[PDB]
Every structure is written in structure tokens, then in C-alpha cells.
Amino acid sequence: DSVDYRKKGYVTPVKNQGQCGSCWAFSSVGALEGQLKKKTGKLLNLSPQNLVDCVSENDGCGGGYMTNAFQYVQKNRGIDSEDAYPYVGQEESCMYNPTGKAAKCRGYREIPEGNEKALKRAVARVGPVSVAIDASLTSFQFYSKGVYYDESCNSDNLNHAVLAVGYGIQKGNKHWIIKNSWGENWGNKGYILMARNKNNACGIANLASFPKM
Numbered sequence: 001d002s003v004d005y006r007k008k009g010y011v012t013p014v015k016n017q018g019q020c021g022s023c024w025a026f027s028s029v030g031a032l033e034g035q036l037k038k039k040t041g042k043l044l045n046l047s048p049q050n051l052v053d054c055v056s057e058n059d060g061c062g063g064g065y066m067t068n069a070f071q072y073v074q075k076n077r078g079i080d081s082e083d084a085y086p087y088v089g090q091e092e093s094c095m096y097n098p099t100g101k102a103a104k105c106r107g108y109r110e111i112p113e114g115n116e117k118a119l120k121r122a123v124a125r126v127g128p129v130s131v132a133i134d135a136s137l138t139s140f141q142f143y144s145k146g147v148y149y150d151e152s153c154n155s156d157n158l159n160h161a162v163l164a165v166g167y168g169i170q171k172g173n174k175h176w177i178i179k180n181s182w183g184e185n186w187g188n189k190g191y192i193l194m195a196r197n198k199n200n201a202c203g204i205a206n207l208a209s210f211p212k213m
């Protein structure tokens with residue numbers, strides 16, 4: 001009925017992505033970080049710069065997809081830690097060094113499109129899932145408290161990557177616990193509670209995936 005992975009050690013502190021369109025990269029390492037806690041008990045910050053700089057299927061600071069980062073981490077035979085490959089908030093030449101590898105992955109799985117009960121099962125059974133939402137409405141961006149629900153939110157306008165780190169219910173309203181990449185000043189300490197079982201509100205279950213480890 002309720003899980004919150006922040007209290008379980010599956011979630012690293014809230015990051016600020018800056019003036020680079022790298023939410024996909026942050027969502028991607030968050031999912032990876034969760035599977036490393038589950039698989040090995042330890043986790044550390046993995047490297048979003050590594051992904052922006054080296055995932056050429058993507059547009060670097062100009063945008064990208066999580067599954068693509070997951071494919072890269074597999075074909076590359078790893079991703080560096082943050083400590084090895086720090087975040088500069090802009091693209092440069094790929095400078096992946098194998099000596100700083102901190103995660104590998106065996107592929108990924110995608111949540112069946114639109115299926116919120118499948119996303120709850122994934123979140124319960126796997127852990128933090130990378131998700132895509134419509135994050136363009138002004139009401140999203142100025143969120144501070146409660147459970148977000150805006151019927152103008154468009155499931156056919158997926159534009160931003162976040163990371164589902166739990167689910168539950170606040171004063172009667174069913175929600176997802178969502179982790180953003182806009183600083184611990186955004187939202188409620190960097191997090192947003194989004195509407196759950198309110199018809200795939202904002203597209204939350206439309207392009208969701210996790211890495212295999």
C-alpha cells in the first residue's frame with residue numbers, strides 16, 4: 001500500500017541540473033543508483049556527465065531518453081561514479097575512464113504503456129523507476145505541497161524525466177513520490193507528489209523504464 005525509497009537508502013540527495021537539458025541523465029543515474037543498492041547493498045552517485053558527454057543517441061544538454069542511457073551503460077560495460085567524472089553542466093568530448101566504473105547493467109525493461117498498476121508493481125518489486133511526464137504546465141513548476149493533479153496536463157506531451165521513488169496516499173489522495181532534478185529548493189525539498197490512479201495523469205506511466213542489474 002505504501003513505499004518510500006528515500007528512507008531505505010535507494011535514493012541519493014537531490015541534484016541541480018543547471019542550464020543543461022539533462023533531466024534524462026539524472027533520471028537515468030537515479031534508476032541505476034537504486035538497482036546498485038538493491039543488488040549490492042551500497043550505492044554511490046553515478047555520473048550524469050558521463051551520459052551527456054558519451055551517449056551520442058541523445059542530444060546532450062539538448063535533450064534525451066533514459067533507455068538510451070541504459071543501452072550505453074551496457075554496451076560500454078559500465079558508467080563512472082560522479083567522483084570519477086564530475087558534473088559540469090555542459091557537453092564536452094566523451095572522457096569515460098574504465099578505472100572509475102561504478103555500475104554496469106544487463107539491459108532494461110519498459111513498463112507497459114499507460115499501465116499505472118504495472119508501474120506500482122515495478123516500483124514495489126524493482127525500486128526507483130525512470131519516468132517521463134508533461135512537466136511544462138506552470139502549476140507543475142510552482143508546486144510546493146500536497147498531491148499534484150491538473151487535468152490540462154497532456155499525456156501525449158512527454159517532455160521531462162524524473163524518477164518515481166515511491167507511492168502512497170496523503171489525506172485521501174493516491175500519489176507517486178517523484179524526484180526532480182531542479183535542486184532541493186524546488187517543490188517540496190526537490191520532490192513532488194503526483195496524482196496516482198487519476199488516468200495516467202501527465203503521462204506518468206507512458207514512457208517508464210528501469211535498468212537490469
Ligand SMILES: CC[C@H](NC(=O)c1ccc(OCc2ccccn2)c(C(F)(F)F)c1Cl)C(=O)C(N)=O
Pocket residue numbers: 017020021022023024061062063064065066131132133135158159160161207
Ligand atoms: C530538454 C529538456 C529535458 N527533456 C528531455 O531531454 C526530454 C525531451 C523529450 C522527451 O520525450 C519526447 C517524446 C516522448 C515520447 C514520444 C515523443 N516524444 C523526454 C521524455 F521524457 F519523454 F523521455 C525527455 Cl526526458 C528535461 O526536461 C530538462 N533537462 O529539464
